Amino acid sequence: STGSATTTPIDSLDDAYITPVQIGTPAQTLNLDFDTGSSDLWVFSSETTASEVDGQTIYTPSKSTTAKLLSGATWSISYGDGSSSSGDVYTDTVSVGGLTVTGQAVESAKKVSSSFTEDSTIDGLLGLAFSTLNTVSPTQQKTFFDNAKASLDSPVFTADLGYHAPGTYNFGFIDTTAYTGSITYTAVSTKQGFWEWTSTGYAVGSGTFKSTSIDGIADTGTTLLYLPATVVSAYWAQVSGAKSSSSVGGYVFPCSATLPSFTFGVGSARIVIPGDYIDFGPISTGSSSCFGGIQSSAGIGINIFGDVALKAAFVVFNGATTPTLGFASK
C-alpha cells in the first residue's frame, strides 16, 4: 500500500505545516502537525478541558464506532519549546492520504498548554520519530508509520515541504518526479529515538564549504534550523546589522537586509537553503527588526534540522531494518 497527503503551512511564515488525517468511523478529519521529532499521535478531543480549546477541530471518540478505550493507558509529553499535553488513549482507525491503519493509538488530550490552545490551526500532532519515544504508559504504543510499515510497498515515508506553499508527505513510495538529481543517503542513529544523522559541513552564501561533522536531527516539527554557535555566528556575520538579542531570544537582523543562502552537506552532496527561507519577519508587528531562521542550538543539547532546512530538500525517511535518511535537491 501507499499514501499521499498534501501538507500546508499554517501561516505566512511557514511556522508549521498541517496535514489532514481521517480518524474513526465515520471519518473525523483533523489537521495534524506531522512531527519527525516525536512519537505520539495526539489530538484535541471532546475530553479536552473546554477552556483550553479555542477553534480547533476535536476528535469525539463516542461518535466513532471503531473507537475503543485503551484501558488504563495515559500519556504526557513535553516538547523542546516548553509546550505540553496529556490525556488518555483510544485505539481507532487512522488514514493518511489513502493509507489506513487499524488499531492505531489515538492519544486524546485532557489538557494542553497555552501555546496549543492559542494555535487554532493545529488539531494535534502525528509523531514520526521512533516508537521508543512514545509516552503512553504503562504500555508504549507504536507510531502510525511503525504500524503501517509492513503493509507499505517500501518501508519509507518522504517529506516534501514547501516554501510559502503546499507540499507533500508520501508513505510507501519515492516520487521520482518530486526532486532533481539524485538522492544522497546518509547513516542514522536511532539511539536517542530520533532521525539523527551527521551533516558533513556548511557554507554561507557563495563562501567556501567548511568540512565539519554536525550531528543533528531531521525534525519536521521544529520551525527553524538550530546549529552550533560557531556556525550560526559565521552565518549572521555576513548580514550587516545582525546581532544576537537576549531580549528577543536569538539572532535578529534589519528587515531591509538581503540574506545570504546557507548550504549544508549530506555526504558529498549539498543542499542550498535560499536566503529568503531564513527570514521569519518582524519580531513584533510593525517592527523593522526581523527574526532569523538560523539560530544557535547551544543549550538545546542537540542540533535540529527543522523546517528551514528540510523544506529546501526532498527528504526520505527510510525505515528499513537499518534506517537511513536521504536528501535530494528539488
Side-chain angles (χ1 to χ4, degrees), residues 1-62 64-67 69-109 112-141 143-148 150-190 192-242 244-330:
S1 62
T2 61
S4 183
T6 298
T7 193
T8 302
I10 64 164
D11 63 24
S12 63
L13 297 177
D14 297 346
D15 280 318
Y17 298 77
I18 49 172
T19 310
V21 177
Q22 282 70 50
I23 308 174
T25 309
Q28 304 178 37
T29 299
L30 273 66
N31 296 327
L32 304 189
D33 186 348
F34 283 23
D35 182 13
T36 63
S38 70
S39 305
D40 287 50
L41 192 175
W42 75 261
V43 297
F44 278 80
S45 76
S46 58
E47 301 176 328
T48 307
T49 299
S51 58
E52 296 179 353
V53 184
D54 186 6
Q56 296 80 9
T57 294
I58 61 166
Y59 168 60
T60 303
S62 69
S64 172
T65 59
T66 42
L69 182 69
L70 187 63
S71 181
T74 58
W75 62 279
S76 181
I77 191 163
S78 299
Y79 297 101
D81 67 358
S83 70
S84 63
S85 49
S86 62
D88 53 20
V89 188
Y90 292 81
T91 56
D92 210 339
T93 302
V94 173
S95 302
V96 176
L99 170 66
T100 300
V101 170
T102 57
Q104 174 64 45
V106 176
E107 305 174 31
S108 169
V112 304
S113 64
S114 59
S115 58
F116 287 115
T117 300
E118 289 159 6
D119 188 356
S120 67
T121 71
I122 291 175
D123 301 326
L125 267 68
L126 189 149
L128 292 169
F130 293 87
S131 293
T132 52
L133 294 180
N134 176 268
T135 77
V136 177
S137 177
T139 307
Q140 187 172 63
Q141 301 295 303
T143 70
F144 175 82
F145 179 54
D146 208 339
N147 282 324
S151 306
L152 295 176
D153 289 359
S154 180
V156 304
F157 68 91
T158 65
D160 180 9
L161 304 180
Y163 167 65
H164 294 349
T168 306
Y169 281 101
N170 290 328
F171 291 84
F173 73 105
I174 289 163
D175 180 356
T176 61
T177 74
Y179 59 85
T180 63
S182 297
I183 304 177
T184 294
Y185 291 84
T186 196
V188 164
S189 172
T190 63
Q192 291 192 89
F194 301 121
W195 291 93
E196 190 172 0
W197 65 290
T198 301
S199 173
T200 47
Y202 70 98
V204 174
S206 60
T208 64
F209 186 85
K210 175 72 168 183
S211 298
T212 184
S213 295
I214 306 168
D215 178 291
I217 67 170
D219 186 358
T220 58
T222 290
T223 312
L224 306 185
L225 173 53
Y226 294 89
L227 292 172
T230 48
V231 179
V232 177
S233 184
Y235 179 80
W236 288 109
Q238 298 303 312
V239 180
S240 299
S244 182
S245 167
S246 53
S247 63
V248 176
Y251 281 90
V252 297
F253 67 94
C255 293
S256 60
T258 297
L259 297 177
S261 62
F262 184 91
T263 300
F264 64 93
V266 182
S268 59
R270 307 286 179 256
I271 300 295
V272 181
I273 305 170
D276 290 346
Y277 289 26
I278 298 162
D279 175 21
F280 280 74
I283 59 173
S284 287
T285 302
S287 181
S288 67
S289 181
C290 275
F291 198 68
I294 295 179
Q295 296 294 346
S296 179
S297 63
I300 296 177
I302 199 159
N303 300 302
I304 304 174
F305 294 87
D307 298 334
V308 166
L310 303 180
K311 78 178 89 168
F314 178 86
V315 188
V316 182
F317 293 80
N318 170 26
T321 298
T322 299
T324 64
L325 272 171
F327 292 82
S329 295
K330 64 187 186 190

